[PDB]
Ligand binder design. Structure first.
Ligand code: NA
Length: 386
C-alpha cells in the first residue's frame, strides 16, 4: 500500500519537442527539409544517460502514407536529462530516402549501447486503404502481398550513442511471415529482459533477439489474437506482458507469457482505450516494484491522456493515476494520441505525447506536434483523482 515516492516533492515540466510547420520555430533538418506534422513518438535512454527521441516526420500532411521520414533529436549531453528546450539538439534524420513511408520507430537499447531501431516501410504509391489522393493528385494503390506493395520491416542501428545510423537493412523475408501485406512494428519500444534477451513487439508476433549484445540473432514468436500495434514489458514476476491497441474502440488487449509462449488476449476492463497506441514502462523491481502505463483513458477520445502505476507482480491492475491535463501545455494544440516513455537519469519519467492543432478537424491538414514531458512518481501519486 505504501510508496515512499509519494513523500518526495512532486515534479513536472513539459514543452513541445517536435514543432509542426504552423508553429513559431518549426523543426526542420539542416538540409532545409521541413514537415507538416510529427507523429508516432518513440523514446529510449541509452546506457550513457543520453535520451533519444524519434518520430515520423510527415512531410506534406498528417496522413499515414506518402513521403514520411524517420527523424530524431538527442539530448546535447548524456547528463542533462532533457530538462529544458536548450538541452535538446536540433532535428536530425535517421532515414528519409525516396518519397515512400519510413516509420513505426521501435527502438531498444542493447547491453553494449548498440541502439537498435526497428522500422516499417511502404512505397510512395501505396497506402493501407488504397485509393487515397497524394499531394500531386496521384491515387494510391492498396498495400498488398507483392514485394513492391507490402509493408517491409527494416532495421538500423547506432554504435555512437545515436550520433549516426546505418542505412536500414531490409529484414522482411526473415522476420515478417510470407504472404503478409499490411504490417507494423511497435510503435514505441522494445525491451531487454532480466534474462538477457531482447523483445520487440510487432503485429501478430514478437521479435526476439538472442546472443551477443549489438550482434543479435533474431527470430519470430508468433502470437494468437495479438493486435497490429503492441507493447511489451517484463512484469515484476519476470513474465512477459503484451498490452496491445484493440482493433475497435474499447479496452486495451492484454496477454501474459514467456519466450515459450503466451496465453490468450483478453480486454483489460480497467484500461479503456479509443483504439489508439499506448506505452508501458518497467520502472523498478525492488519493493515496491512498479510498472507504468500511458494511454488515452477513454473509449471515444484520444484527448484523455492518463499515466498510471501498477504494483502487481503481473500488472493485473493499474491505479487511476494522473491526467496529463493536470499539467497542460499551452500553444501546441490539443494533447493526446500516441505516447512513449523512458526513465531519465535524474529519477523522473520522460514521456513523448502527440498533440493535434485540429485546425482542419479530422482532416489531412491538421498540424500535429509532439510534447515532451517529465514528471516523477510523486507527481503521479499526488493526483487529485486517486
Ligand atoms: Na523521404
Amino acid at each position: 500500500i505504501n510508496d515512499p515516492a509519494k513523500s518526495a516533492a512532486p515534479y513536472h515540466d513539459e514543452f513541445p519537442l517536435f514543432r509542426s510547420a504552423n508553429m513559431a520555430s518549426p523543426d526542420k533538418l539542416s538540409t532545409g527539409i521541413g514537415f507538416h506534422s510529427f507523429r508516432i513518438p518513440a523514446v529510449v535512454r541509452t546506457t550513457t544517460g543520453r535520451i533519444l527521441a524519434f518520430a515520423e516526420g510527415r512531410r506534406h500532411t498528417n496522413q499515414d502514407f506518402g513521403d514520411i521520414n524517420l527523424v530524431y533529436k538527442r539530448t546535447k549531453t548524456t547528463a542533462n536529462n532533457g530538462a529544458s528546450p536548450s538541452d535538446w539538439e536540433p532535428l536530425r534524420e535517421v532515414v528519409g530516402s525516396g518519397a515512400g513511408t519510413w516509420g513505426n520507430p521501435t527502438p531498444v537499447v542493447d547491453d553494449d549501447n548498440t541502439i537498435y531501431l526497428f522500422l516499417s516501410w511502404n512505397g510512395a504509391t501505396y497506402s493501407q486503404n488504397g485509393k487515397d489522393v497524394l499531394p500531386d493528385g496521384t491515387v494510391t494503390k492498396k498495400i498488398d502481398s507483392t514485394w513492391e506493395g507490402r509493408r517491409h520491416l527494416y532495421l538500423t542501428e547506432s554504435r555512437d550513442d545515436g550520433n549516426t545510423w546505418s542505412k536500414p537493412v531490409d529484414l522482411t523475408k526473415e522476420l515478417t511471415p510470407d504472404g503478409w501485406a499490411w504490417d507494423a512494428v511497435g510503435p514505441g519500444n522494445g525491451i531487454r529482459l532480466t534474462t538477457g534477451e531482447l523483445v520487440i513487439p510487432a503485429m501478430g508476433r514478437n521479435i526476439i533477439g538472442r546472443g551477443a549484445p549489438g550482434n543479435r540473432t533474431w527470430s519470430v514468436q508468433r502470437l494468437s489474437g495479438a493486435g497490429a500495434e503492441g507493447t511489451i514489458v517484463q512484469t515484476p514476476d519476470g513474465k512477459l506482458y503484451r498490452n496491445d491497441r484493440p482493433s475497435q474502440k474499447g479496452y486495451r488487449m492484454v496477454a501474459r507469457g514467456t519466450l515459450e509462449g503466451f496465453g490468450a488476449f483478453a480486454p483489460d476492463a480497467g484500461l479503456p482505450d479509443p483504439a489508439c497506441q499506448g506505452s508501458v514502462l518497467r520502472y523498478n523491481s525492488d519493493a515496491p516494484a512498479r510498472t507504468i502505463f500511458l494511454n488515452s483513458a477513454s473509449g471515444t477520445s484520444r484527448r484523455a491522456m492518463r499515466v498510471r502505476i501498477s504494483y502487481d507482480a503481473d500488472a493485473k491492475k493499474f491505479n487511476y493515476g494522473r491526467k496529463l491535463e493536470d499539467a497542460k501545455v499551452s500553444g501546441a494544440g490539443h494533447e493526446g494520441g500516441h505516447s512513449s516513455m523512458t526513465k531519465t537519469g535524474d529519477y523522473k519519467i520522460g514521456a513523448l505525447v502527440e498533440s493535434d492543432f485540429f485546425n482542419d478537424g479530422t482532416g489531412k491538414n491538421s498540424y500535429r506536434a509532439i510534447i515532451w514531458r517529465r514528471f516523477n512518481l510523486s507527481w503521479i501519486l499526488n493526483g487529485p483523482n486517486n
